[PDB]
């Protein structure tokens, strides 16, 4: 019942992996023990499942230095145990120094969230993007250009994901008693390859959140 | 406020990104046109948040060819909207031909799931790993060596994640009506960088799942 082309495609991946390992052995033999050495990551990166470039390459780090979560539209929903487990583990167990949320403008989950279709299973997840729009409706309604409005929605979605990280007890507690981690919101431009810091202002955002949720 | 070293560390990432873009301009004339190509991924890769190497490198593919999800212990829980959204989007919208779950032996979420502690918010997520043990208790109890037992648990966790992918309506409907996608379970060996195919029987697993849930 499984077409032969899918079996060949799968077998080609294993050929590519063997070639990739051969090339790493000739060019960089130290990589395998370095890879297996055991490193604690200093970064948590939350990005889009539609990955354009691996986080560690963008950041010029080794993959073992970045704990990674990717999901549709780089969301941090309040009641998502998947992302909340990544955050609580990275802070309380790995003691990461930085949490980054990184979005991009390339048509993915955010554009999917703007299509007025019943996508069954997907509607609840994409609703979180639509709720970012509703939080910033006064700003986004006033932006005439379709591309500009879409880009600002992508930015504000990163900013609200960052807000949702900062709201976690784990981030508050750890920053109070250890001065880390700090939360950053970034945009990756696929047209230029450049990161842009959206300059979240971790401390101000934390202050605003603490108005009804001051742990100490 | 926030310590100076965190600010310096964040600043270094931006310097690395600039350097990284320079080297990509020399080595690959159309990288940034390729990076924004709009090319639809043929693979969904579900792996561990404790990533050792990017999926697309291991598989010798470009990052835009691999839709990615990473979570603690590479789980596909029934009730997790985060992972179920990644799977439903990849199948129904991207029409990926392959879904891969890939685990590895480097101490991560699986080892955390074997620590008999109250980790608050983490308990429900890590419980899924403990339930893999209980499903395969006779087999794992028969393995005397701690490292061998741990390794087999990591493999069975990949296998059960793959079974949870195959159980999705999206995978069954699409495979019935179009003969794709196929699901594969892999182990990445950090010592050698080689993939190992766990040879999950997609046809047999789909046949077993269909006994009470035959879509057509």
Short mmCIF file of C-alpha atoms in Angstrom, two decimals:
data_model
loop_
_atom_site.label_atom_id
_atom_site.label_comp_id
_atom_site.label_asym_id
_atom_site.label_seq_id
_atom_site.Cartn_x
_atom_site.Cartn_y
_atom_site.Cartn_z
CA UNK A 1 0.00 0.00 0.00
CA UNK A 2 3.10 2.33 0.49
CA UNK A 3 4.17 3.61 -2.98
CA UNK A 4 7.74 2.64 -3.97
CA UNK A 5 8.70 6.36 -4.54
CA UNK A 6 8.09 7.14 -0.79
CA UNK A 7 10.42 4.16 0.17
CA UNK A 8 13.12 5.44 -2.27
CA UNK A 9 12.70 9.02 -0.95
CA UNK A 10 13.11 7.72 2.66
CA UNK A 11 16.20 5.59 1.67
CA UNK A 12 17.75 8.71 -0.05
CA UNK A 13 17.56 10.52 3.36
CA UNK A 14 19.71 7.74 4.89
CA UNK A 15 22.16 8.01 1.89
CA UNK A 16 22.31 11.85 2.46
CA UNK A 17 22.91 11.23 6.21
CA UNK A 18 25.81 8.75 5.46
CA UNK A 19 27.36 11.27 3.00
CA UNK A 20 26.85 14.10 5.57
CA UNK A 21 28.61 11.93 8.27
CA UNK A 22 31.48 11.00 5.81
CA UNK A 23 32.01 14.75 4.98
CA UNK A 24 31.99 15.68 8.73
CA UNK A 25 34.58 12.95 9.41
CA UNK A 26 36.95 14.22 6.68
CA UNK A 27 36.46 18.01 7.25
CA UNK A 28 35.73 18.23 11.00
CA UNK A 29 36.45 15.04 13.06
CA UNK A 30 36.28 16.98 16.40
CA UNK A 31 32.52 17.73 15.84
CA UNK A 32 31.31 14.24 16.84
CA UNK A 33 32.88 14.19 20.36
CA UNK A 34 31.98 17.90 20.71
CA UNK A 35 28.38 17.04 19.71
CA UNK A 36 28.29 14.12 22.20
CA UNK A 37 30.23 16.02 24.91
CA UNK A 38 27.14 17.26 26.79
CA UNK A 39 26.47 21.03 27.01
CA UNK A 40 23.75 22.88 28.91
CA UNK A 41 21.96 25.36 26.55
CA UNK A 42 22.06 29.07 27.55
CA UNK A 43 19.23 29.98 25.06
CA UNK A 44 15.58 28.89 24.63
CA UNK A 45 14.41 29.76 21.09
CA UNK A 46 10.65 29.70 20.29
CA UNK A 47 10.07 29.97 16.52
CA UNK A 48 7.78 28.95 13.67
CA UNK A 49 7.45 25.29 12.46
CA UNK A 50 8.00 26.85 8.97
CA UNK A 51 11.76 27.15 9.74
CA UNK A 52 13.81 29.10 7.10
CA UNK A 53 17.17 28.68 8.94
CA UNK A 54 18.13 26.71 12.07
CA UNK A 55 18.12 28.99 15.17
CA UNK A 56 21.77 28.13 16.08
CA UNK A 57 23.05 29.18 12.58
CA UNK A 58 21.16 32.58 12.63
CA UNK A 59 22.69 33.15 16.10
CA UNK A 60 26.14 31.72 15.05
CA UNK A 61 26.00 29.18 17.96
CA UNK A 62 26.32 25.35 18.13
CA UNK A 63 22.92 23.54 18.10
CA UNK A 64 23.57 22.20 21.67
CA UNK A 65 23.64 25.83 22.92
CA UNK A 66 19.96 26.42 21.83
CA UNK A 67 16.99 24.56 23.41
CA UNK A 68 14.33 24.80 20.63
CA UNK A 69 10.52 24.85 20.36
CA UNK A 70 8.79 25.41 17.00
CA UNK A 71 5.00 25.53 16.51
CA UNK A 72 2.57 27.15 14.02
CA UNK A 73 2.93 30.98 14.13
CA UNK A 74 5.46 30.90 17.04
CA UNK A 75 2.68 31.04 19.71
CA UNK A 76 2.86 30.83 23.51
CA UNK A 77 -0.83 30.25 24.41
CA UNK A 78 -1.62 30.52 28.20
CA UNK A 79 -3.04 26.95 28.50
CA UNK A 80 -0.68 25.14 26.02
CA UNK A 81 1.06 22.46 28.18
CA UNK A 82 3.47 21.73 25.26
CA UNK A 83 5.05 25.24 25.20
CA UNK A 84 4.56 25.81 28.98
CA UNK A 85 6.54 22.57 29.62
CA UNK A 86 9.36 23.79 27.31
CA UNK A 87 9.45 27.15 29.23
CA UNK A 88 9.22 25.60 32.76
CA UNK A 89 11.95 22.96 31.92
CA UNK A 90 14.31 25.53 30.22
CA UNK A 91 14.05 27.95 33.23
CA UNK A 92 13.76 25.61 36.27
CA UNK A 93 15.97 22.70 35.04
CA UNK A 94 18.32 24.07 32.26
CA UNK A 95 18.59 27.63 33.78
CA UNK A 96 18.73 29.25 30.27
CA UNK A 97 19.90 32.90 30.43
CA UNK A 98 17.77 34.06 27.44
CA UNK A 99 14.36 33.18 25.99
CA UNK A 100 13.84 34.41 22.41
CA UNK A 101 10.61 34.40 20.40
CA UNK A 102 11.43 34.83 16.70
CA UNK A 103 8.90 35.38 13.89
CA UNK A 104 9.29 36.02 10.14
CA UNK A 105 7.13 37.51 7.37
CA UNK A 106 7.21 34.45 5.01
CA UNK A 107 3.58 33.20 4.41
CA UNK A 108 2.96 30.54 7.13
CA UNK A 109 0.66 30.19 10.18
CA UNK A 110 -0.03 33.96 10.54
CA UNK A 111 -1.36 34.15 6.91
CA UNK A 112 -3.29 30.85 7.55
CA UNK A 113 -4.88 32.59 10.63
CA UNK A 114 -6.22 35.38 8.30
CA UNK A 115 -8.00 32.95 5.87
CA UNK A 116 -11.71 32.96 6.88
CA UNK A 117 -12.11 29.12 6.56
CA UNK A 118 -13.25 26.41 9.04
CA UNK A 119 -9.92 24.50 9.32
CA UNK A 120 -11.36 22.08 11.95
CA UNK A 121 -8.59 21.11 14.44
CA UNK A 122 -6.53 24.23 13.46
CA UNK A 123 -9.15 26.94 14.34
CA UNK A 124 -8.40 27.02 18.12
CA UNK A 125 -4.61 27.33 17.55
CA UNK A 126 -4.88 30.08 14.86
CA UNK A 127 -7.53 31.91 17.00
CA UNK A 128 -4.58 33.06 19.24
CA UNK A 129 -3.21 35.11 16.24
CA UNK A 130 -6.70 36.59 15.58
CA UNK A 131 -6.76 37.59 19.30
CA UNK A 132 -3.42 39.51 18.81
CA UNK A 133 -5.18 41.50 16.02
CA UNK A 134 -8.14 42.17 18.43
CA UNK A 135 -5.73 43.36 21.22
CA UNK A 136 -4.11 45.89 18.74
CA UNK A 137 -7.17 46.52 16.49
CA UNK A 138 -6.98 50.37 16.90
CA UNK A 139 -3.35 50.31 15.62
CA UNK A 140 -3.80 47.68 12.83
CA UNK A 141 -7.11 49.07 11.36
CA UNK A 142 -5.31 52.44 10.81
CA UNK A 143 -2.52 50.83 8.63
CA UNK A 144 -3.72 51.26 5.01
CA UNK A 145 -1.10 49.12 3.22
CA UNK A 146 -1.95 45.34 3.31
CA UNK A 147 1.79 44.31 3.50
CA UNK A 148 2.56 46.86 6.26
CA UNK A 149 -0.55 45.79 8.33
CA UNK A 150 0.40 42.07 7.90
CA UNK A 151 4.07 42.78 8.91
CA UNK A 152 2.94 44.73 12.01
CA UNK A 153 0.61 41.81 12.95
CA UNK A 154 3.63 39.40 12.65
CA UNK A 155 5.65 41.76 14.95
CA UNK A 156 2.83 42.17 17.52
CA UNK A 157 2.31 38.36 17.52
CA UNK A 158 6.04 37.97 18.54
CA UNK A 159 5.57 40.74 21.17
CA UNK A 160 2.40 39.06 22.65
CA UNK A 161 4.18 35.61 22.63
CA UNK A 162 7.03 37.33 24.63
CA UNK A 163 4.39 38.81 27.04
CA UNK A 164 2.99 35.26 27.54
CA UNK A 165 6.53 33.95 28.41
CA UNK A 166 7.11 36.81 30.87
CA UNK A 167 3.74 36.03 32.60
CA UNK A 168 5.04 32.52 33.67
CA UNK A 169 5.81 32.19 37.45
CA UNK A 170 9.09 30.40 36.41
CA UNK A 171 10.40 33.48 34.48
CA UNK A 172 9.25 35.95 37.22
CA UNK A 173 10.69 33.87 40.15
CA UNK A 174 14.01 33.18 38.34
CA UNK A 175 14.50 36.84 37.26
CA UNK A 176 13.69 38.09 40.82
CA UNK A 177 16.17 35.70 42.56
CA UNK A 178 18.86 35.29 39.81
CA UNK A 179 18.39 38.31 37.38
CA UNK A 180 17.79 35.84 34.46
CA UNK A 181 16.40 34.79 32.09
CA UNK A 182 15.61 37.88 29.98
CA UNK A 183 13.01 37.67 27.16
CA UNK A 184 13.70 39.00 23.63
CA UNK A 185 11.38 39.30 20.62
CA UNK A 186 13.00 39.08 17.17
CA UNK A 187 11.98 39.22 13.51
CA UNK A 188 14.03 37.27 10.95
CA UNK A 189 13.96 38.87 7.48
CA UNK A 190 14.18 36.10 4.78
CA UNK A 191 14.78 38.83 2.06
CA UNK A 192 18.10 39.95 3.81
CA UNK A 193 18.96 37.22 6.39
CA UNK A 194 19.16 39.94 9.10
CA UNK A 195 17.74 39.57 12.63
CA UNK A 196 15.89 42.62 13.99
CA UNK A 197 15.45 43.12 17.77
CA UNK A 198 11.83 44.32 18.38
CA UNK A 199 13.18 45.70 21.73
CA UNK A 200 10.50 44.14 24.02
CA UNK A 201 11.59 45.97 27.26
CA UNK A 202 11.55 42.88 29.52
CA UNK A 203 11.58 44.90 32.84
CA UNK A 204 8.67 47.26 31.85
CA UNK A 205 6.59 44.30 30.53
CA UNK A 206 7.35 42.37 33.77
CA UNK A 207 6.33 45.51 35.84
CA UNK A 208 2.95 45.77 33.95
CA UNK A 209 2.27 42.02 34.43
CA UNK A 210 3.14 42.29 38.17
CA UNK A 211 0.22 44.80 38.79
CA UNK A 212 -2.13 41.81 39.63
CA UNK A 213 0.56 39.00 39.69
CA UNK A 214 3.47 40.23 41.98
CA UNK A 215 5.09 36.96 43.31
CA UNK A 216 7.45 38.90 45.73
CA UNK B 1 18.03 45.96 36.52
CA UNK B 2 19.39 43.35 34.04
CA UNK B 3 23.10 42.39 34.24
CA UNK B 4 25.56 43.70 31.65
CA UNK B 5 26.74 40.21 30.60
CA UNK B 6 23.27 39.21 29.35
CA UNK B 7 23.13 42.45 27.30
CA UNK B 8 26.62 41.75 25.88
CA UNK B 9 25.67 38.14 25.07
CA UNK B 10 22.54 39.30 23.22
CA UNK B 11 24.65 41.91 21.30
CA UNK B 12 27.12 39.15 20.21
CA UNK B 13 24.23 37.21 18.56
CA UNK B 14 23.50 40.23 16.32
CA UNK B 15 27.23 40.51 15.39
CA UNK B 16 27.21 36.75 14.55
CA UNK B 17 24.06 37.23 12.38
CA UNK B 18 25.82 40.01 10.39
CA UNK B 19 28.95 37.83 9.96
CA UNK B 20 26.75 34.78 9.09
CA UNK B 21 25.00 36.86 6.32
CA UNK B 22 28.41 38.00 4.84
CA UNK B 23 29.62 34.33 4.57
CA UNK B 24 26.26 33.24 2.99
CA UNK B 25 26.59 36.10 0.38
CA UNK B 26 30.10 34.83 -0.66
CA UNK B 27 29.32 31.02 -0.53
CA UNK B 28 25.75 31.10 -2.08
CA UNK B 29 24.77 33.80 -4.65
CA UNK B 30 20.96 33.08 -4.54
CA UNK B 31 20.71 31.91 -0.84
CA UNK B 32 18.28 34.75 0.09
CA UNK B 33 16.11 34.13 -3.07
CA UNK B 34 16.23 30.38 -2.16
CA UNK B 35 15.46 31.30 1.54
CA UNK B 36 12.23 33.15 0.47
CA UNK B 37 11.47 30.69 -2.42
CA UNK B 38 7.97 29.60 -1.18
CA UNK B 39 9.00 25.91 -1.68
CA UNK B 40 6.56 23.55 0.18
CA UNK B 41 8.30 21.13 2.63
CA UNK B 42 7.98 17.37 1.78
CA UNK B 43 8.99 16.32 5.37
CA UNK B 44 7.56 17.01 8.85
CA UNK B 45 10.19 16.23 11.52
CA UNK B 46 9.07 15.88 15.18
CA UNK B 47 12.08 15.90 17.54
CA UNK B 48 13.28 16.80 21.04
CA UNK B 49 13.62 20.47 22.22
CA UNK B 50 17.17 19.37 23.32
CA UNK B 51 18.33 19.47 19.65
CA UNK B 52 21.92 18.21 18.90
CA UNK B 53 21.88 19.03 15.13
CA UNK B 54 19.26 20.67 12.90
CA UNK B 55 16.95 18.10 11.20
CA UNK B 56 17.71 19.44 7.67
CA UNK B 57 21.54 18.99 8.19
CA UNK B 58 21.21 15.32 9.45
CA UNK B 59 18.93 14.64 6.41
CA UNK B 60 21.21 16.67 4.02
CA UNK B 61 18.24 18.94 3.03
CA UNK B 62 17.67 22.74 3.02
CA UNK B 63 15.80 23.99 6.17
CA UNK B 64 12.81 25.12 3.99
CA UNK B 65 12.34 21.46 2.92
CA UNK B 66 11.66 20.34 6.58
CA UNK B 67 8.62 21.55 8.59
CA UNK B 68 9.79 21.17 12.23
CA UNK B 69 8.24 20.63 15.68
CA UNK B 70 10.38 20.15 18.81
CA UNK B 71 8.97 19.53 22.32
CA UNK B 72 10.25 17.81 25.54
CA UNK B 73 10.88 14.09 24.82
CA UNK B 74 9.52 14.28 21.20
CA UNK B 75 5.91 13.47 22.32
CA UNK B 76 2.68 13.36 20.29
CA UNK B 77 0.07 13.35 23.10
CA UNK B 78 -3.58 12.68 21.93
CA UNK B 79 -4.92 15.90 23.51
CA UNK B 80 -1.97 18.27 22.62
CA UNK B 81 -3.43 20.93 20.28
CA UNK B 82 0.14 22.30 19.67
CA UNK B 83 1.49 19.07 18.05
CA UNK B 84 -1.93 18.10 16.56
CA UNK B 85 -2.00 21.53 14.79
CA UNK B 86 1.52 20.97 13.37
CA UNK B 87 0.41 17.50 12.07
CA UNK B 88 -3.01 18.70 10.68
CA UNK B 89 -1.38 21.73 8.92
CA UNK B 90 1.57 19.64 7.49
CA UNK B 91 -0.85 16.97 6.09
CA UNK B 92 -3.94 19.02 5.04
CA UNK B 93 -2.20 22.28 3.94
CA UNK B 94 1.52 21.48 3.13
CA UNK B 95 0.67 17.90 1.88
CA UNK B 96 4.04 16.58 3.29
CA UNK B 97 4.83 13.06 1.99
CA UNK B 98 6.75 11.99 5.14
CA UNK B 99 6.30 12.54 8.89
CA UNK B 100 9.35 11.55 10.99
CA UNK B 101 9.64 11.29 14.80
CA UNK B 102 13.30 11.30 15.81
CA UNK B 103 14.67 10.77 19.34
CA UNK B 104 18.24 10.47 20.74
CA UNK B 105 19.95 9.01 23.83
CA UNK B 106 21.54 12.28 25.18
CA UNK B 107 20.06 12.88 28.72
CA UNK B 108 16.93 15.08 28.20
CA UNK B 109 13.14 14.87 28.84
CA UNK B 110 13.07 11.02 28.94
CA UNK B 111 15.57 10.98 31.90
CA UNK B 112 13.55 13.82 33.56
CA UNK B 113 10.41 11.57 33.23
CA UNK B 114 12.21 8.78 35.24
CA UNK B 115 12.97 11.08 38.23
CA UNK B 116 10.29 10.30 40.86
CA UNK B 117 9.72 14.05 41.77
CA UNK B 118 6.68 16.37 41.79
CA UNK B 119 7.76 18.79 38.98
CA UNK B 120 4.37 20.64 39.16
CA UNK B 121 3.39 21.88 35.65
CA UNK B 122 5.81 19.31 34.01
CA UNK B 123 4.16 16.15 35.56
CA UNK B 124 1.32 15.77 32.98
CA UNK B 125 3.76 16.12 29.99
CA UNK B 126 6.41 13.71 31.44
CA UNK B 127 3.63 11.26 32.51
CA UNK B 128 3.29 10.37 28.75
CA UNK B 129 6.87 8.90 28.89
CA UNK B 130 6.09 6.96 32.13
CA UNK B 131 2.98 5.58 30.30
CA UNK B 132 5.27 4.29 27.45
CA UNK B 133 7.22 2.34 30.13
CA UNK B 134 3.89 0.93 31.52
CA UNK B 135 2.71 -0.06 27.96
CA UNK B 136 6.02 -2.02 27.43
CA UNK B 137 6.67 -2.94 31.11
CA UNK B 138 7.34 -6.69 30.51
CA UNK B 139 9.91 -5.87 27.79
CA UNK B 140 11.69 -3.05 29.71
CA UNK B 141 11.71 -4.91 33.14
CA UNK B 142 13.55 -7.81 31.35
CA UNK B 143 16.49 -5.46 30.48
CA UNK B 144 18.87 -5.61 33.49
CA UNK B 145 21.38 -2.94 32.33
CA UNK B 146 20.23 0.64 33.24
CA UNK B 147 21.71 2.19 30.01
CA UNK B 148 20.22 -0.53 27.72
CA UNK B 149 16.76 -0.21 29.47
CA UNK B 150 16.95 3.63 29.09
CA UNK B 151 17.90 3.29 25.36
CA UNK B 152 15.00 0.89 24.68
CA UNK B 153 12.59 3.30 26.51
CA UNK B 154 13.84 6.17 24.21
CA UNK B 155 13.16 3.90 21.15
CA UNK B 156 9.68 2.79 22.37
CA UNK B 157 8.84 6.48 23.09
CA UNK B 158 9.66 7.28 19.38
CA UNK B 159 7.58 4.24 18.32
CA UNK B 160 4.54 5.30 20.44
CA UNK B 161 4.87 8.94 19.17
CA UNK B 162 4.81 7.50 15.56
CA UNK B 163 1.71 5.39 16.45
CA UNK B 164 0.01 8.61 17.77
CA UNK B 165 0.79 10.33 14.39
CA UNK B 166 -0.68 7.35 12.44
CA UNK B 167 -3.85 7.51 14.64
CA UNK B 168 -4.64 11.10 13.41
CA UNK B 169 -7.69 11.34 11.03
CA UNK B 170 -5.51 13.62 8.80
CA UNK B 171 -2.85 10.89 8.21
CA UNK B 172 -5.46 8.08 7.76
CA UNK B 173 -7.79 10.12 5.44
CA UNK B 174 -4.84 11.40 3.32
CA UNK B 175 -3.19 7.93 3.10
CA UNK B 176 -6.54 6.27 2.14
CA UNK B 177 -7.52 8.94 -0.45
CA UNK B 178 -4.02 9.82 -1.79
CA UNK B 179 -1.53 7.17 -0.45
CA UNK B 180 0.56 9.70 1.62
CA UNK B 181 2.01 10.61 4.03
CA UNK B 182 4.12 7.70 5.36
CA UNK B 183 5.32 7.86 9.00
CA UNK B 184 8.89 6.93 10.08
CA UNK B 185 10.55 6.57 13.51
CA UNK B 186 14.27 7.31 13.85
CA UNK B 187 17.00 7.45 16.48
CA UNK B 188 19.83 9.97 15.98
CA UNK B 189 23.10 8.64 17.45
CA UNK B 190 25.11 11.63 18.86
CA UNK B 191 28.30 9.40 19.02
CA UNK B 192 28.37 8.91 15.15
CA UNK B 193 25.79 11.35 13.66
CA UNK B 194 24.10 8.39 11.89
CA UNK B 195 20.30 7.98 11.69
CA UNK B 196 18.93 4.55 12.65
CA UNK B 197 15.54 3.53 11.17
CA UNK B 198 13.36 1.91 13.91
CA UNK B 199 11.43 0.33 10.99
CA UNK B 200 7.92 1.11 12.33
CA UNK B 201 5.57 -1.02 10.19
CA UNK B 202 3.37 1.79 8.82
CA UNK B 203 1.03 -0.61 7.00
CA UNK B 204 0.68 -2.96 10.01
CA UNK B 205 0.32 -0.06 12.49
CA UNK B 206 -2.33 1.58 10.29
CA UNK B 207 -4.10 -1.83 9.97
CA UNK B 208 -4.10 -2.26 13.79
CA UNK B 209 -5.38 1.31 14.38
CA UNK B 210 -8.14 0.79 11.75
CA UNK B 211 -9.66 -2.21 13.63
CA UNK B 212 -11.99 0.14 15.59
CA UNK B 213 -11.30 3.27 13.48
CA UNK B 214 -11.53 2.36 9.74
CA UNK B 215 -12.21 5.66 7.90
CA UNK B 216 -13.07 3.99 4.55
#
